[PDB]
């Protein structure tokens, strides 16, 4: 509707309660109060839908090097893997199947 | 200009200065443009000469530079038309009948 | 009408008659880098990004 | 809280003891009067004139950075 | 969710999604040698080498304030490349830009390096702040490990390892422990831990529709006068 | 001549190769040390840097590290042509030969 | 020799050509290695931007004029133009026309000095297009593998040998010019693929082309020679020979 | 066999790191609701880094909105019914000027 | 297919025979707008939805047309 | 956590040595006042 | 390899001292008539162009 | 655990209360410190409607106060007649007349309609970003299927023998 009442009672029609409590405090909150500009422990929400890139393997090495097994994985990959990129993408099972036929002969 | 009514004894002080500012810097736009052209600035305006007499071309080059500035200065007659038309309306309204 | 005719002549038409932009270029390395860069990211596009 | 508020505290340290410890809890009217003039952290003690300067100084400075950087 | 309904949203007078060569009246036109007397142009073929030198300047002048932090230098390199790889990967046809896209980006990066040479660029001040907050947390963990104490991160890792054993010891019908199930185990522990901390209210509304601020105190009035300091 | 290394000031040393075998071993160690280099053991004298995950900007970082270790002043015109391990080896030879005859460093 | 040169260590032959979009100059010159935070001076002193524009734009611009001051010491610039400016300066208070005629020869003198003191810039893209057509050069050199080890190009002082070039023995031309407008230099090249090096020595002169008054090419290579040196092979390639090129075309003899 | 054992191990760690990125974002997003109900400076704190990039646009005087955005979607929404419908060109700085001028045999440089 | 089937069907999208004679609201609502009502934003949605139906959500036709 | 200062349950000595976010701003302004001694002088 | 990315379509002009050297001054302009005398020839011989001559005669 | 660096570089001319660089975010923070927090009313009714009679008294008190103080009020009413007629007849079309006469001039409406649509896009931010992640998570899950196959090869090779 376009006829909500008098001008004095205009701020009255805004509140909508989720409970059955009476009387109802009329004031409708506009924003959330932010008294102290505190640095949030939460991670940034910009890191939302970024595709795979260099930061993924760079951080993988940093977290893998925190383990003994991960240190062996990183060293063997960066030295003994003929790839022109660290952004490994599996689009076929050629390297997998040929590694099994060369292994199961025993 | 309403927010400057109490900033001075003249309500249109900023407008009276701005029309002069607008005139001076617009008048300087063609002057700086010819400076950017260089010594060849006349060839940018009129093009290639036609007669071998440098004195003859000088008169055609003087008119080419004259027209260069007339294209700008003559447009201020449009501003006079707006002020004259704006004043005529103010004169009719301010003298309209009320008894 | 005089307002539009003022700025459409003092600036727009005046500078259209005495200034211009060239169409010839002196360097074209962005075009050939984008082609090589696209082949570098061929596998990622194949995954539908 | 600012150094001027802390300077008032050292001067009013004995007055705060009389009001908050003795008057603010005795009884009746003396209790209400002592709890009304209690001494402590200023409720709604922000100075808007200080804050008006900080805001206008920052906004005018961002304009100075643009107008002077030519 | 919500999608733009206007089908002509990306239409410009120059074409669909054209932000490289917008249509204007003074369009570029060719010049003919035999008919041109003189010309005033600022275009040149120097943007390629200026692009190379600018990368070396920005990299080397930023590494002055890294204090030899090798991980920070390698991280900064990945960030610096993302700034220079903009024209090579953008949807915008940077090769069809109005008056030379190469010159435009080189002049744009020179304005960045000028700030970098003075150590006043916001990317630099952001890097020092982020790195200081990171090293302060790494030093906290190092002091707890030297003291034989267990870090908060190891307590969750150890707590999450025993949760998988308990779930895979009761799930004997199926034996496919997917990454989806592994995730919701950790998230159930993360929510409980985040709710345990005394954090400032991040969400606008709590369990009720009311806001979680200090201002959200309505009637009934049940608080007395504020009390003073104790001696 | 001193630089920070992990928060500690360390005196930096300069190298003088002046021999073909020392140049090849230095360049290989240089490229292998770069954190973006893939297949570090498959790297040989005839290895293209593009085949090891390196682009035009990684060649600048590699050349920047040559100026650190050898003390060269490499101009921006030379960097975009260094795209192979062989190119770094031949360039280092050309700089040392130029200084041995002309008595000065190449133009920067 | 490059006339415009600051204390900046990199890109010496491009210093006058590169037009940076800087508002003011960088705090420090381009670093040649990674430095310490205390190696440089935080918050440069007051009036630093004005000082940098003097020592990086004004001062090297004056060293360009001083380095090539021998090219502006002719009787026209030294005696005629100042003498003409002094004749009309005595009547500068009579009317405005004398002020103009007393200042014009000064502005004319500045333009000749400004044009003659600049570094000699040839059309280098013509040169590389010329050498990349030769099969004996492209056998060892390619654009994607070539690098510059040294570059030198400077005007030749005074009048040349008055048997190889009788043109410059003209009293009318000598009144306006004290030099030849010819230049000579070399190009030290190296190829990272083949390991070959060559010295590209060249001599240039202004020639008339296709028209009556305008110069055709201010820097025409009438002698272009290359001494290619490889692992064990020394070759000498003659792209343009002066004994044959000077029989077809003659210099231009700039006036004003 | 050890070649693909370590290759697939590193390949999995790359996409496990990507999985944790999307998982952790959806986790932090649970506390963020109704961007219209947050103040200006608090919304920037949730999206840390936007204030830094905003300072970069200001200090370099790139005060043309959406000039450095590849898809200036806000620029298209603002010009849905504009005369001479156009968006700013990519990385357009308000100070650059590529205007030229030539003199031909004809007038007006034609 | 059923969605496009009904969009093309003349019986589904067809004015009545007397529609030409009826009084027609010749505005979408952007001439006089309610500025201070609590449903102000919902009014703007209906204006935008009315303008989209007129141009089949190709608002370039509205930009070129007469207002 | 539970020892955080309360404006109601506060000691006199704790209020005098509070040093909150208001003082942290002032201490930053004081650093600017001191560093400007030679310029103003 | 900067020459690899140089565009030869900029060779349409030969700019030197703010003047295109490939200008047909023998067919257009004040320098077109070949019946000029000793003084007119010596005047064009100095300037080498009409644009520089006309610009100076403007102030003279 | 290796000992990390003690600290990074600390800029001597950048602080939180006096940031070196400028943006609207810092200005927005100082602005809300000035106007203070949102003055939330805890009451059941708004202040104006509860004190209409009282505010009407003080409303008319200041009208009378100005009226009793201004002895030349008739000179001000007459002095205001000309500008009141002039400015209203001059700006009528641009404010109101355009809504039913020659031109609509919908420039300001276009700015409301675009902002009203952005209000909805921000309200549905969580939905739109979650759908974009569903496609990226699908790609990530597809790449993680190769590791699940490899971890069964040891069992396959053992059971096949
Ligand atoms: C009441 C106020 C009224 C006025 C209002 C405006 C006020 C004035 C302000 C305007 C701006 C003035 C400032 C100019 C700065 C110039 C700086 C400079 O010198 O740089 C050089 C620069 C030239 O360099 P370039 O163009 O970049 O390139 C040159 C090539 O590289 C060169 O290529 P090249 O080598 O092939 O060329 C050869 C040579 C060819 O030259 C020749 O033609 C030769 C001439 C003949 C010489 C004599 C030969 C003698 C022969 C003797 C023979 C002896 C031998 C005999 C035999 C031998 C005996 C043994 O050309 C030159 O080198 C000469 C070019 C420079 C000439 C000087 C031009 C400026 C003169 C101004 C004089 C008055 C200034 C007063 C200002 C006072 C301060 C306020 O000069 C200019 O750019 C001039 C631009 C002028 C544009 C502005 C015009 C504005 C229009 C004004 C009139 C408006 C009227 C309407 C007004 C309406 C109301 C507003
Ligand atoms: C009902 C209406 C009643 C009206 C009357 C009262 C109106 C209220 C006035 C309030 C505003 C003015 C405040 C005046 C002082 C009041 C006390 C006060 O500041 O508030 C408590 C204040 C607490 O601040 P807050 O507002 O509660 O909250 C702070 C926020 O959290 C954030 O912390 P924050 O630090 O960022 O906040 C700073 C805060 C407070 O910052 C301050 O410290 C106030 C500084 C004000 C100027 C003091 C320097 C005066 C230099 C005198 C030179 C000597 C003269 C005699 C020479 C001897 C030879 C005869 O805000 C202001 O800056 C306010 C300044 C307002 C603008 C003043 C300049 C206007 C320029 C336009 C020209 C106008 C012409 C008339 C100007 C007349 C000037 C005399 O306490 C302190 O700040 C303690 C300061 C501790 C360090 C002090 C070390 C000395 C520093 C002196 C300055 C040295 C600069 C270099 C020398 C320059 C001259 C050579
Ligand atoms: C009077 C009061 C004076 C008070 C003082 C005033 C101030 C004087 C001092 C300052 C002087 C001004 C300074 C100017 C120099 C500044 C630099 C400059 O601008 O360049 C020079 C400037 C360049 O001129 P230009 O236009 O570039 O030359 C054209 C072409 O470029 C040239 O093309 P071209 O070189 O290829 O060939 C040119 C010519 C070929 O020319 C030649 O080849 C001839 C060369 C002859 C050389 C002879 C050498 C002799 C050497 C000395 C003798 C040998 C040694 C003897 C030793 C004896 C020892 C004792 O070819 C032709 O066929 C010419 C066309 C036909 C002639 C047109 C004449 C029009 C006259 C109209 C009036 C006629 C009335 C007749 C009545 C007569 C009785 C009163 O020269 C001039 O400014 C000339 C003055 C132009 C004034 C035009 C307006 C006035 C028109 C005439 C007045 C009409 C009379 C009105 C009153 C009637 C009742 C009396
Ligand atoms: C020695 C003896 C003398 C000394 C005695 C000392 C005692 C003095 C008595 C002073 C009383 C102070 C305590 C109350 C202060 C505020 C009064 C008030 O109405 O606040 C409630 C009202 C709403 O409170 P709420 O019920 O909680 O609703 C909250 C929602 O936000 C509501 O928003 P919503 O949109 O959702 O709902 C409707 C809203 C609708 O209202 C609004 O949202 C805005 C209304 C327009 C605001 C004023 C625009 C003025 C533009 C500036 C041009 C004039 C400036 C004056 C100074 C210029 C230089 C002389 O407000 C209402 O609920 C109904 C309207 C109630 C009347 C309020 C407007 C009356 C005019 C007040 C302006 C007075 C100055 C100009 C008067 C002529 C010059 C003397 O708040 C306001 O209107 C704020 C306006 C600014 C307040 C300060 C203005 C100065 C003091 C006002 C005194 C009013 C009576 C005397 C003047 C009347 C002349 C006709
Ligand atoms: C009669 C008494 C003297 C009368 C007054 C004379 C004042 C002269 C000084 C003020 C005017 C200087 C010129 C200002 C305008 C040009 C700005 C500029 O410098 O740009 C340089 C420009 C810089 O080049 P640029 O500006 O084109 O850009 C360079 C290109 N990039 C950007 C790529 C690097 O160079 C020149 O123009 C050539 C040098 C100009 C020389 C200027 C005059 C010097 C006078 C020296 C006198 C020495 C003897 C007396 C002193 C003795 C010791 C105390
Ligand atoms: C409010 C207080 C502050 C006021 C500040 C001023 C606010 C101005 C708001 C922006 C309006 C600017 C209008 C620019 C023109 C927009 C229309 C257009 O692009 O034309 C496209 C037009 C229209 O094409 P169209 O396709 O976009 O629209 C078609 C129209 N319908 C839909 C009706 C069919 O096409 C043209 O190419 C014509 C070009 C004519 C140029 C007219 C403008 C010339 C003047 C501009 C330069 C002025 C510079 C002054 C600087 C002074 C410095 C001293
Ligand atoms: C330099 O660059 C610039 C800026 O920075 C970027 C700007 O912000 C700005 C904008 C300017 C502003 C935002 C400031 C605006 C301030 C204005 C208009 C006037 C301020 C007026 C007041 C705050 C009113 C104060 C009232 C009075 C002074 C009258 C009563 C007298 C008082 C209170 C003082 C008594 C007099 C004395 C001589 C004693 C002084 C007392 C002290 C020093 C006590 C202080 C005590 C301590 C412990 C510090 C500009 C123009 C600028 O150019
Ligand atoms: N074809 C052209 N079209 C438009 N403007 C041009 C053209 N050629 C040059 N200009 C302008 O004239 C200037 C001088 O041209 P010039 O050929 O001398 O540059 P250059 O760098 O020395 O070329 P090169 O590398 O071949 O020696 C150029 O910087 C340019 O601004
Ligand atoms: Mg050149």
Please, could you describe this protein's structure?
Chain K: Keywords: Membrane, Transmembrane, Transmembrane helix. Chain K: This is Transmembrane protein, putative. Chain K: It comes from Tetrahymena thermophila (strain SB210). This is part of a larger assembly, with twelve protein chains of eleven kinds. Chain F is mostly helical. Chain F has helices at residues 20-33, 56-70, 85-102, and strands at 2-5, 8-11. Chain F is globular. With 60 residues, chain K is mainly alpha-helical. Chain K is built from two helices and two strands, in the order ββαα. Chain K has helices spanning 38-47, 50-59, and strands at 15-16, 19-20. Chain K has a two-stranded antiparallel ribbon. In chain K, strand 1 (15-16) and strand 2 form a beta hairpin. Chains E and H meet through strand 1, strand 3, helix 4, helix 5 and helix 7 of E and helix 1, helix 3 and strand 1 of H. Strand 3 of chain E pairs antiparallel with strand 1 of chain H. The complex binds cardiolipin (CDL) (4 copies), 1,2-diacyl-SN-glycero-3-phosphocholine (PC1) (2 copies), Ubiquinone-8 (UQ8), adenosine-5'-triphosphate (ATP) and magnesium ion (MG). Residues 121-124 of chain G line the site of magnesium ion.
H/E element sequence of chain B: HHHH
Per DSSP E runs of 2 or more residues, the count of β-strands of chain B stands at: 0
- What molecules are bound to this protein? cardiolipin, 1,2-diacyl-SN-glycero-3-phosphocholine, Ubiquinone-8, adenosine-5'-triphosphate, magnesium ion
- What level of helicity do the residues of chain D show? over 70%
Q: For the CA atoms, what is the radius of gyration of chain D?
A: 21 Å
Question: What percentage of amino acids of chain B are in beta strands?
Answer: under 5%
User: Could you tell me how far the N terminus lies from the C terminus of chain B, measured between alpha carbons in angstroms?
Assistant: 31 Å
Counted beta strands of chain D: 0
Total of helices of chain B? 4
**Helical element count of chain D?**
4
- Dominant shape of chain B: elongated
Largest sheet of chain B: none
Which bin fits the share of residues in helices of chain B? 55-70%
Structural class of chain B: mainly alpha
Q: What oligomeric state do the depicted chains represent?
A: part of a larger assembly
Shape of chain D: rod-shaped
Which protein chains make the most extensive interface, counting residues with beta carbons within 8 Å of the other chain's beta carbons? E-H, 58 and 44 residues
- Rounded to an integer in angstroms, the radius of gyration calculated over CA atoms of chain B is 22 Å
Major sheet size, sense and barrel closure of chain D: none
Protein name (chain D): Transmembrane protein, putative
Binding site for ubiquinone-8 (chain D): 57, 64
Organism (chain D): Tetrahymena thermophila (strain SB210)
Keywords (chain D): Membrane, Transmembrane, Transmembrane helix
């Amino acid at each position: 509707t376009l006829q909500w009442g008098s001008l004095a009672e205009r701020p009255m029609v805004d509140r909508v309660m989720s409970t059955s409590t009476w009387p109802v405090p009329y004031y409708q909150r506009l924003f959330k109060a932010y008294p102290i500009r505190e640095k949030k422990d939460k991670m940034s929400l910009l890191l939302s839908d970024i595709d795979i890139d260099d930061t993924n393997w760079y951080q993988a090495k940093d977290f893998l090097r925190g383990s003994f097994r991960g240190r062996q994985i990183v060293d063997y990959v960066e030295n003994n893997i003929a790839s022109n990129t660290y952004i490994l993408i599996q689009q076929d099972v050629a390297n997998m199947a040929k590694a099994y036929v060369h292994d199961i002969c025993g | 200009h309403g927010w400057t009514s109490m900033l001075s004894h003249a309500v249109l002080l900023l407008s009276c200065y701005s029309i002069i500012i607008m005139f001076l810097f617009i008048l300087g736009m063609p002057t700086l443009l010819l400076y950017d052209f260089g010594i060849f600035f006349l060839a940018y305006l009129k093009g290639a000469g036609k007669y071998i007499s440098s004195v003859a071309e000088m008169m055609f080059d003087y008119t080419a530079c004259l027209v260069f500035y007339i294209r700008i200065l003559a447009q201020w007659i449009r501003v006079v038309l707006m002020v004259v038309t704006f004043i005529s309306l103010s004169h009719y309204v301010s003298d309209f009948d009320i008894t | 009408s005089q307002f539009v005719a003022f700025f459409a002549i003092v600036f727009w038409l005046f500078l259209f008659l005495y200034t211009f932009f060239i169409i010839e270029k002196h360097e074209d390395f962005f075009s050939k880098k984008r082609e090589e860069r696209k082949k570098k990211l061929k596998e990622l596009w194949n995954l539908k990004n | 809280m600012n150094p001027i508020q802390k300077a008032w505290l050292k001067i009013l340290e004995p007055v705060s003891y009389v009001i908050n410890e003795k008057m603010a809890k005795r009884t009746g009217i003396i209790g209400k009067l002592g709890r009304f003039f209690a001494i402590g952290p200023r409720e709604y003690g922000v100075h808007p004139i200080n804050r008006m300067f900080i805001f206008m100084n920052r906004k005018y400075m961002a304009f100075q950075a643009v107008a002077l950087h030519r | 969710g919500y999608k733009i309904r206007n089908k002509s949203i990306f239409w410009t007078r120059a074409g669909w999604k054209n932000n490289w060569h917008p249509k204007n009246f003074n369009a570029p036109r060719p010049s003919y040698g035999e008919f041109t007397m003189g010309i005033r142009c600022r275009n040149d073929h120097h943007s390629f080498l200026r692009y190379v030198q600018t990368y070396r300047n920005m990299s080397r002048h930023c590494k002055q304030y890294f204090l030899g932090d090798k991980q920070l230098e390698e991280t900064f390199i990945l960030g610096l490349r993302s700034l220079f790889l903009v024209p090579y990967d953008s949807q915008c046809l940077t090769d069809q830009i109005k008056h030379g896209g190469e010159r435009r980006f080189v002049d744009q990066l020179d304005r960045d390096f000028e700030l970098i040479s003075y150590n006043t660029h916001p990317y630099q001040l952001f890097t020092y702040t982020v790195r200081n907050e990171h090293l302060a947390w790494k030093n906290e963990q190092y002091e707890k490990i030297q003291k034989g104490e267990k870090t908060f991160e190891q307590e969750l890792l150890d707590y999450l390892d025993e949760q998988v054993l308990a779930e895979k010891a009761k799930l004997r019908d199926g034996q496919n422990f997917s990454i989806e199930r592994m995730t919701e185990i950790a998230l159930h522990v993360f929510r409980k831990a985040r709710a345990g901390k005394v954090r400032p209210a991040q969400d606008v509304r709590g369990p009720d529709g009311n806001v979680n601020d200090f201002l959200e105190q309505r009637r009934p009035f049940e608080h007395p006068n504020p009390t003073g300091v104790t001696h | 001549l001193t630089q920070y290394v992990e928060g500690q000031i360390v005196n930096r040393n300069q190298l003088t190769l002046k021999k073909q075998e020392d140049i090849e071993q230095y360049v290989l160690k240089l490229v292998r040390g770069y954190f973006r280099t893939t297949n570090k053991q498959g790297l040989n004298i005839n290895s293209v840097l593009q085949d090891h995950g390196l682009d035009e900007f990684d060649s600048i970082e590699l050349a920047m590290q040559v100026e650190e270790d050898l003390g060269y002043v490499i101009s921006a015109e030379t960097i975009p042509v260094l795209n192979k391990v062989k190119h770094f080896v031949n360039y280092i030879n050309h700089v040392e030969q130029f200084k041995a005859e002309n008595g000065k460093a190449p133009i920067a | 020799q490059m006339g415009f040169s600051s204390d900046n260590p990199y890109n010496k032959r491009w210093e006058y050509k590169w037009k940076h979009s800087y508002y003011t100059y960088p705090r420090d010159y381009e670093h040649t290695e990674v430095r310490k935070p205390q190696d440089s001076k935080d918050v440069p002193p007051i009036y630093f931007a004005y000082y940098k524009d003097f020592v990086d734009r004004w001062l090297p611009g004056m060293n360009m004029w001083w380095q090539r001051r021998h090219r502006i010491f002719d009787k026209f610039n030294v005696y005629f133009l100042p003498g003409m400016s002094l004749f009309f300066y005595q009547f500068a208070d009579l009317a405005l026309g004398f002020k103009i005629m007393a200042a014009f020869p000064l502005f004319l003198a500045y333009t000749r000095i400004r044009d003659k003191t600049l570094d000699p810039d040839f059309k280098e893209t013509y040169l590389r297009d010329m050498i990349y057509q030769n099969p004996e050069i492209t056998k060892y050199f390619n654009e994607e593998t070539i690098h510059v080890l040294d570059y030198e190009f400077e005007y030749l002082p005074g009048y040349l040998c008055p048997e190889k070039f009788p043109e410059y023995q003209n009293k009318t031309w000598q009144f306006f010019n004290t030099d030849t407008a010819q230049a000579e230099g070399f190009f030290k090249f190296g190829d990272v693929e083949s390991g070959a090096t060559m010295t590209l020595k060249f001599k240039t002169m202004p020639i008339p082309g296709k028209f009556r008054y305008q110069v055709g090419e201010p820097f025409y290579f009438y002698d272009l020679r290359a001494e290619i040196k490889c692992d064990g092979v020394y070759k000498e390639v003659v792209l343009v020979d002066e004994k044959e090129s000077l029989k077809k075309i003659r210099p231009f003899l700039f006036l004003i | 066999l050890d070649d693909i054992e370590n290759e697939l191990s590193f390949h999995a760690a790359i996409w496990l790191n990507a999985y944790a990125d999307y998982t952790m974002f959806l986790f932090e997003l649970e506390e963020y609701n109704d961007p219209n109900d947050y103040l200006m400076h608090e919304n920037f704190d949730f999206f840390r880094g936007l204030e830094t990039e905003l300072e970069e646009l200001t200090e370099t005087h790139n005060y043309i909105p959406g000039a450095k955005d590849d898809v200036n979607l806000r620029g298209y929404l603002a010009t849905q019914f504009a005369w001479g419908k156009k968006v700013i060109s990519f990385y357009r700085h308000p100070a650059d000027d590529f205007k030229c001028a030539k003199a031909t045999k004809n007038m007006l440089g034609r | 297919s059923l969605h496009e089937k009904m969009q093309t069907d003349y019986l589904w999208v067809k004015d009545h025979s007397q529609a030409d004679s009826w009084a027609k609201a010749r505005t979408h609502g952007y001439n006089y707008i309610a500025h201070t009502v609590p449903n102000k934003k919902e009014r703007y949605e209906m204006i935008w939805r009315s303008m989209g139906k007129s141009t089949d959500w190709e608002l370039e036709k509205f930009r070129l047309g007469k207002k | 956590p539970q020892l955080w200062p309360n404006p109601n349950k506060l000691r006199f000595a704790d209020l005098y040595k509070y040093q909150g976010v208001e003082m942290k701003k002032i201490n930053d302004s004081i650093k600017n006042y001191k560093a400007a001694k030679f310029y103003i002088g | 390899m900067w020459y690899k990315y140089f565009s030869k379509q900029s060779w349409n002009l030969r700019v030197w001292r703010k003047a295109n050297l490939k200008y047909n001054q023998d067919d257009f302009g004040m320098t077109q008539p070949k019946y000029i005398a000793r003084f007119g020839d010596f005047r064009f011989r100095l300037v080498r162009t009409e644009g520089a001559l006309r610009g100076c005669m403007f102030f003279v | 655990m290796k000992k990390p660096m003690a600290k990074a570089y600390e800029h001597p001319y950048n602080s939180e209360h006096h940031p070196l660089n400028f943006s609207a975010v810092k200005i927005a923070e100082t602005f809300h410190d000035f106007i203070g927090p949102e003055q939330v009313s805890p009451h059941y009714e708004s202040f104006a409607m509860s004190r209409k009679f009282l505010l009407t008294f003080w409303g008319g008190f200041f009208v009378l106060n100005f009226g009793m103080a201004t002895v030349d009020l008739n000179w001000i009413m007459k002095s205001t007649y000309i500008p009141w007629i002039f400015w209203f007849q001059l700006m009528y079309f641009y404010v109101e007349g355009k809504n039913s006469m020659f031109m609509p001039l919908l420039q300001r409406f276009y700015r409301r309609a675009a902002a009203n649509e952005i209000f909805t896009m921000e309200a549905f931010y969580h939905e739109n970003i979650e759908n974009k992640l569903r496609n990226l998570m699908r790609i990530t899950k597809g790449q993680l299927e190769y590791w699940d196959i490899h971890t069964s090869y040891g069992e396959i090779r053992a059971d096949s023998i």
